[PDB]
Every structure is written in C-alpha cells, then in structure tokens.
Amino acid sequence: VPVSVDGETLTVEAVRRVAEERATVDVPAESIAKAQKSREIFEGIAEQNIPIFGVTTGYGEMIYMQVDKSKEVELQTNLVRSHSAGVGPLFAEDEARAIVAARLNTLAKGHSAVRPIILERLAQYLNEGITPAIPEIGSLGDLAPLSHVASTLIGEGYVLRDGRPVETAQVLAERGIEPLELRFKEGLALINGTSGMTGLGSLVVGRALEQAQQAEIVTALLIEAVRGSTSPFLAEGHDIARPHEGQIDTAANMRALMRGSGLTVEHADLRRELQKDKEAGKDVQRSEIYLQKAYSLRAIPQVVGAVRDTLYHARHKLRIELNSANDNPLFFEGKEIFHGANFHGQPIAFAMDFVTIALTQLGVLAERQINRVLNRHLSYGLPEFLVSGDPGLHSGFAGAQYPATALVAENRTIGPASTQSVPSNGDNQDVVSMGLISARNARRVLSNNNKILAVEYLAAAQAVDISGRFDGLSPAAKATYEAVRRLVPTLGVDRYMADDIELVADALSRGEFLRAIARETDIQLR
C-alpha cells in the first residue's frame, strides 16, 4: 500500500492513509531526478554571488540585507531557529505526519531547488515513525510550525514521543541517523509554504466527509425508528428538479440506507390513510396524521447536500494545493528565478473557513433531530425523553440533550479567520491568511459534531428499543443499531451518561459507523 508523493497526484485520502494508517511513502525517481534538476538550475546561478531572496539575502522585510555565500549553512540554521517560535499545544501524531507529507509533496513537485536528500530525509521520517513536535500556534498562514519541523531535520527542536516532546538530538543519535546540515534555500523552502493548514485541512476535510456519511447513517436510522416518509428522498426531487451534486448524493445515500425498511412509509400510503380519516361532510377538519414531517426529517438532502458541496469544493482546493509548489522563490527551465507569493495560504484559508461554516450547520441539524425524538409532542408517539422507567421519576435522555444543544451554541462562537489578517514584519507581511487557524476552527467543529452525533446515535437506538421496532428496521438500520448496542446498552433506568456518550463519540471519530455499514451490507455510500 505505498503512496506516491510526486508533487502531482497526491490525494486527500492518500494523505490520510500516510497520517492515520502509517502508510508507507515513496518519492518517485522521476521526482528525485526532477528535484536534482532544479537544484542545478539554482546552483548554476548560486555559483556566482548574484542576488536571490532567502538564499543570498535576508529574510522578510530584511530582504534589503545582501548576504555572501560564506556562511551558507549558518543562514539556514539561523532562520530555522529564530523562526521556531511556535506556542500552544502540540499537534497530534497523525496531524504532524500530514503536515510533513504535504511539505514533502511540495518539494517533490520539483521547482524548489532543494537537494534530493531533503526529500529523502523527510520521506524517511514518515516511514521510520519519527514525528516532529509541532506546536499549533504561530502561523499567519505557516512559518513557525514548519520551522519546528525543519529543526528536527537538522537534529534540533523536538520530536513527538508518546504524546511528549523529546529532544531530536537524542532520538536521531539513537536510531543512528546523522542530522542533516541545510544548504542554500533549503531552510527557506522547508518552511515557506502552506503545509501546516494544507496538511491539517486534508485530515479535517477527509473526516468531514465521513462525518457527512455518518450523519446520514444515523439520520436514516432515526427516520425509520419514527416511520417517516420516504418522499423527501425520491430522485425526481434532486436528480431532476434541483441538481446540486451534494443534494443528489445525500438523497441517493438516504435511499440506499433506508432501502428495504418495513417501518418507513410511502407518500401514497399517507395520502390514502389521511384521506380515509377525513369526513367528506365538512370543509375544515382536524387530523393527527402528518402528510409531511418537520424540516429536520424532510430537508436532509438540501442541508447535508449543501454541506457536501462545500466539502467537495474544499477537497478540490486541497488536492490542487497539496500538488502545488507552495514555496518561494521557485525555479523553472531556462527561466529567471520566479519571485512570487505561492506561500500565501488564502485559497486554503478560505476553503477551511467554509468548512467550519458547513459543519456547524451539519451540527445544527443533528441537534434539532435529537430535539425531535426527545420531545413528546414532536416524536410522533414515543415517550418523553425516551424514558423506559416511570417518567418524571426517571429523566431518560433529558440531561444528555444538553451537551448537544450546548455544542451547537459553542460552534456558532467560532468565527472565520481567513479575513483576520494583521500586518507584521515591518509591514512586509501586510496581508496574511491565518489559514492554519481556519483549519483548526474546522477541526474543532468536526470534533464537537462527533459528540452531537453521539447523542443522536444513542437516542436513535433507544427509540428503537422503546418502540419495539427493531424487527422492522432495514438491513442498514439493523447494522447501525447493532454497532451502537455493541458499545452501549439500552437505557432501562437512569445512569451516568457521560462515558456512554464519549464512547460513541470516539467511535464516530474513528469511522466505526461507516465501517459497520461497509461490513454488514454492500452499500457503498457516496
């Protein structure tokens, strides 16, 4: 299962494989050769003492400082050090690995003028399990975080071991590795890109998509458990009447998940049951039958679909970015040293701010579906707060609804960061993107959404037990139901709810509910 880091075809899912599943990485000889190439282009110029940014000059506003080739190695060392000023908590192992891979892929595109050893060493770290200790704060959108990574290649800084930072010097001398010594433009190239936000963003987006699927999965279970109509998901509504890709995809997944359900109702059945319930003698009469259900159980295609569209767009931008030469300056055949701003992370800063927004609404919808099932006037029949015990004496899921509701409110306090640029570096960086903050914002909402969904999964499984509708559940709903009971038992009388919720929340973050559908059925969700 090797992953080709060529600076051209790396996908978001592949980055997750490398970061999450320790997937082996391989930098193609073509990438290596193309890499050495640009290296000679550069050196063929660096030979002379001619001016070039970040290699024969100062850094930032100090580009006005001309520097000779004498202390080539020191210039790189001074940069990586002075810029390793990151603060806050350290990124997690998988997060740090995703960042490292994005940077490797970037250098592997071939226009950074870096020695092949840089790519080879980076590739060794991932493959050898040596993860840099990357503090989360510092990037203006990603100098500081990438600087901490840079430090570990030169045997400095810290590496992540069992959740704690351990000096890189020891770890290397340990597994017998001579720390690299950075040459011209290697220090700058290592840190002058969007690898922080792009690496983290990839994990988040990939996971956001699974969350969309897992929202659809429990949403489907809930719809069955309450015998909702299937009309809202009919293809004519989306494939033909309002063709947004996301909407079509969710409507599709919903039909597959509820297919073969004995509990769901066809519109025609409602229309006919409702009709018989009417007295042809009077113009206006009351009925207890709802031809339609509330928005939270009817508008799933529109809302989750819009979220999907947002995630598709974000994945699209990341795929391009991962495979871009987000670095400066750059080198091309018979070309002058390209001086631009491909280090600017606006594209990804925007994409992630949009992910934050989309996932917030995904959570808003899940929480209202929980409110749906817990409220007796809205549940369509189930007992208040899903009590099995004498009600009042027992509260059921009443208290468990609070953290879900609370999280919706907390996610709404998270504002966009891609527009919060603040000028620094003597007005040199007068417009930045703060994209890493955007990525972290989306990560937070994603994380909070698993807790919201956790309560929804527990609630949906409980509604099944109380209604005694298990034998009517569809193949998918049975799988979902069983995956939940496997982790948490039915709620007879009241009990400490926290562990159960965190138990189902962690399962969701590991994609165990998407897994269950995969194993127990042949449905291949979009």
Ligand X SMILES: N[C@@H](Cc1ccc(O)cc1)C(=O)O
Please, where are the H alpha helices in 323-395?
A: 346-374
Q: Pick one of ligand X, a copy of itself, none as the site partner of residue 246 (Cβ within 5 to 8 A by kind).
A: a copy of itself
Of 20-28, 33-41, 420-428, 504-512, which part binds a copy of itself (CB under 8 A)? 420-428
Between 337 and 476, name the residue whose CB sits nearer to ligand X.
Answer: 337
Q: Are 72 and 184 in contact (CB under 8 A)?
A: yes
Rounded to a whole number of angstroms, the minimum distance from the CB of residue 327 to ligand X is 8
Between 349 and 484, name the residue whose CB sits nearer to a copy of itself.
Answer: 349
CA–CA separation, 338 and 212 (whole Å): 41
CA–CA separation, 320 and 326 (whole Å): 10
Report the Cα 32 to chain-centroid distance in Å: 30
Q: Pick one of a copy of itself, ligand X, none as the site partner of residue 59 (Cβ within 5 to 8 A by kind).
A: ligand X
The DSSP line for 152-219 is HHTT-SEEEETTEEEEHHHHHHHTT-PPP---TTHHHHHHSSSHHHHHHHHHHHHHHHHHHHHHHHHH
Length of the chain: 526
CA–CA separation, 48 and 68 (whole Å): 10
Q: Which of residues 251-310 bind a copy of itself (CB under 8 A)?
A: 266-268, 270-271, 274-275, 277-278, 280, 282-296, 298-299, 301-303, 305-307, 309-310
The two tokens of residue 271 are 């229309």
Q: Which of residues 399-418 bind a copy of itself (CB under 8 A)?
A: 411-412, 415-416, 418
Q: Are 181 and 218 in contact (CB under 8 A)?
A: no
Question: CA angle, corner 399, sides to 396 and 402, nearest 5?
Answer: 140
Between 82 and 419, name the residue whose CB sits nearer to ligand X.
Answer: 82
Q: Which of residues 54-73 bind ligand X (CB under 6 A)?
A: 54, 59-60
Q: Tell me which of 21, 40, 71, 502 binds a copy of itself, using CB under 8 A.
A: 71
Q: Which of residues 386-445 bind ligand X (CB under 6 A)?
A: 425
The two tokens of residue 91 are 């990124």
Between 51 and 129, name the residue whose CB sits nearer to a copy of itself.
Answer: 51
Q: Pick one of a copy of itself, ligand X, none as the site partner of residue 416 (Cβ within 5 to 8 A by kind).
A: a copy of itself
Q: Which of residues 264-323 bind ligand X (CB under 6 A)?
A: 293
Q: Decide if residue 192 touches ligand X (CB under 6 A).
A: yes
Question: Radius of gyration over alpha carbons of the chain, in Å?
Answer: 27
Between 36 and 420, name the residue whose CB sits nearer to a copy of itself.
Answer: 420
Q: Measure CA of the first residue to CA of the last residue in the chain; give whole Å.
A: 23
Q: Tell me which of 38, 56, 296, 328 binds ligand X, using CB under 6 A.
A: 328
Q: Pick one of a copy of itself, ligand X, none as the site partner of residue 65 (Cβ within 5 to 8 A by kind).
A: a copy of itself
Residues that bind ligand X (CB under 6 A): 54, 59-60, 192, 293, 328, 343, 425
